[PDB]
Structure 1
Amino acid sequence: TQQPIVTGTSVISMKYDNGVIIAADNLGSYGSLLRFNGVERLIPVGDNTVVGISGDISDMQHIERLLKDLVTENAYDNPLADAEEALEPSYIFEYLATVMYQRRSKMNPLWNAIIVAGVQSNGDQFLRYVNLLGVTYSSPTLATGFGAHMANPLLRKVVDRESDIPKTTVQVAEEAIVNAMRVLYYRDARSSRNFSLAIIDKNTGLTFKKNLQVENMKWDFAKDIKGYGTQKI
C-alpha cells in the first residue's frame, strides 16, 4: 500500500487504417496541483511498440527500466532478435499486464495506467490498456485519466466501431489526437502545453515527435466576459 506523489496525467491513443497513434504531455504534477515539466511518458520498445504511462513517475521510471531490461534479455542467445523473434506489442503488454496484476495481488501496486500501442509482425494494429488493478481492455480509441472523459468522446466521432478503422487515414487520426490534446490543455489543471506524439505505421515504421506545442487556441472571447452575472463593466 502506497500513495502517488509525482504523477503524469492522461495518455490518449487511437487506431487508423495502417497503424496506431499515441500522445502524452511532458508534465509531472505535485500535491496541490504544483507543476513540473520535462518528463517523457512515451517509452519506445524496439521499432514496432510505444508504451504510454500515466500515474506515479517513480513507478513509471521502474517500468521504463523493466522494458529496457526486457529488450536486453530477448537479445540473449537469439540470432533472430532483430527479425522473427523480435519483441511484439502483444508480448510487451502481456509482461506488463502480468506484473501489474501480481503487484496488486501483493497489495504493493505500481500506481500507473498504461497503454501499449504498436503494429504486430502480420501488420495487425495493437492497442490495449492495463492499470494498477491489472484490469485490461482493448478499443479502437483508448485514453487514461481525464483523456477517458474528454479525449475518447472526440476520438470515437472518428472511429466509433471496428469497421471505421479502414476508412480512417493517418492525416485524420493525427488531427483528431492533436485537437484532443488542446481540449485537455483547456480543461485539465494537471496538463501542459508541451506534449510528445508517436505514430507506429506498418508501411512507414515508428515516427516519434517530441517538443510539440498546442497551437490555434481560442482565448479572444475572454475579453467580452465581465463579472459573474450582473456586472456590466
Structure 2
Amino acid sequence: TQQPIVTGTSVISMKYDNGVIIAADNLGSYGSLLRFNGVERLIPVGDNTVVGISGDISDMQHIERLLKDLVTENAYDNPLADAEEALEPSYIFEYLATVMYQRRSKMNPLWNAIIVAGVQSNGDQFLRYVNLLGVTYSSPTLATGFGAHMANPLLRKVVDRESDIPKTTVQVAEEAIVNAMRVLYYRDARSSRNFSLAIIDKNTGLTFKKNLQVENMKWDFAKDIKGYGTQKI
C-alpha cells in the first residue's frame, strides 16, 4: 500500500473505421503543483501498439521499462520477431493486466489506469482498459480519470455503439479527440495545454504526434462577467 506522488491525469481514446486513436497530456503533477511539463505518457510498443498511462508516474516509468524489456525478450531466439511472432496489442495488454492484478493481490499495486490501444495482425482494432485493481473492460470509447466523466460523453456522441465504428473516419475521430482534450483543459485543474496524440491505423500504421496544443479556445465572454450576483461594475 502506497499513495501516488507525481501523477498524470486523463488518458482518452476511441475506435474508428480503420484503427484507434489515443491521447494524453504532457503533465506530471505533484499534488496541486504543476511540477513537470515535459512528461510523455503515451508509450509505443513496436509499430502496432500504444500504451497510454495515467496515475503515479514512478510506476509509469517502471511499466515503461517492463514493456521495453518485453520487446527485448520477444526478440530472443525468434527469427519472426519482426513478422508473424511480433508482439500484438492483445499480448501486451494481457501481460499488463496479469501484472496489475497480481500486484493488487499482494496489496502493493501499481497506482495507474492504463489504456492499451492498437491494431491486431488481422487488422482488428484493439482497445482495452486496466487499472490498479486489475479491473479490465473494453468499449468503443475509453477514458481514465476526468476523461471518463467528460471525454466519454463527447466521444460516445460519435461512436455510440459497435455499429458506428465503420461509419467513423480518422478525421472525424481525431477531431472529437482534440475537442475532448480542449474540454478537459477548460475543466480539469490537473491538466495542461500541451499533449501528445497517437493514431494506429491498419493501413498507414503508427502515427505519433508530439507537442500538440489546445487551440481555438473561447475566453472572450469572460469580460462581461462581473461580481457574483448583484455587482454591476
Q: TM-score range by the shorter chain?
A: over 0.9
Q: How far 1:63 sits from its partner (Å)?
A: 0.1
Q: How many angstroms apart in 1 are the aligned matches of 2:99 and 2:173?
A: 31
State percent identity of aligned pairs.
100
Q: CA contact under 8 A between 1:48 and 1:88: conserved in structure 2?
A: yes
Q: How far 1:159 sits from its partner (Å)?
A: 0.2
| TM-score (norm: length of structure 2) | 0.99
Deviations 1:193-218 (A, max 9, x none): 00000000000000000000000000
Q: CA contact under 8 A between 1:21 and 1:197: conserved in structure 2?
A: yes
Q: CA contact under 8 A between 1:33 and 1:189: conserved in structure 2?
A: no
Deviations 1:157-192 (A, max 9, x none): 000000000000000000000000000000001000
Q: How far 1:36 sits from its partner (Å)?
A: 2.3
Q: How many angstroms apart in 2 are the aligned matches of 1:45 and 1:35?
A: 27
Q: How many angstroms apart in 2 are the aligned matches of 1:32 and 1:187?
A: 15
Q: How far 1:31 sits from its partner (Å)?
A: 2.0
| TM-score (norm: length of structure 1) | 0.99
Q: Residue 47 of structure 1: SS of its match in structure 2?
A: coil
Deviations 1:81-111 (A, max 9, x none): 0000000000000000000000000000000
Q: CA contact under 8 A between 1:12 and 1:24: conserved in structure 2?
A: yes
**Count of aligned pairs:** 233
Deviations 1:34-64 (A, max 9, x none): 4421100000000000000000000000000
Q: How many angstroms apart in 1 are the aligned matches of 2:221 and 2:206?
A: 39
Q: CA contact under 8 A between 1:197 and 1:208: conserved in structure 2?
A: yes
Q: How many angstroms apart in 2 are the aligned matches of 1:195 and 1:87?
A: 26
Q: Residue 222 of structure 2: SS of its match in structure 1?
A: helix
Deviations 1:105-128 (A, max 9, x none): 000000000000000000000000
Q: How many angstroms apart in 2 are the aligned matches of 1:78 and 1:202?
A: 24
Q: Residue 147 of structure 1: SS of its match in structure 2?
A: helix
Q: How many angstroms apart in 2 are the aligned matches of 1:117 and 1:82?
A: 19
Q: CA contact under 8 A between 2:9 and 2:191: conserved in structure 1?
A: yes
Q: How many angstroms apart in 1 are the aligned matches of 2:150 and 2:190?
A: 14
Q: How many angstroms apart in 2 are the aligned matches of 1:32 and 1:219?
A: 23
Q: How many angstroms apart in 1 are the aligned matches of 2:57 and 2:35?
A: 13
- C-alpha RMSD over aligned residues: 0.6
Q: How many angstroms apart in 2 are the aligned matches of 1:63 and 1:192?
A: 23
Q: Residue 200 of structure 2: SS of its match in structure 1?
A: strand
Q: CA contact under 8 A between 2:32 and 2:190: conserved in structure 1?
A: no
Q: How far 1:154 sits from its partner (Å)?
A: 0.1
Q: CA contact under 8 A between 1:8 and 1:56: conserved in structure 2?
A: yes
Which blocks of at least 5 consecutive residues in structure 1 are unaligned?
none
Q: Residue 80 of structure 1: SS of its match in structure 2?
A: coil
Q: CA contact under 8 A between 1:35 and 1:190: conserved in structure 2?
A: no
Q: How far 1:33 sits from its partner (Å)?
A: 4.2
Q: How many angstroms apart in 1 are the aligned matches of 2:198 and 2:28?
A: 19
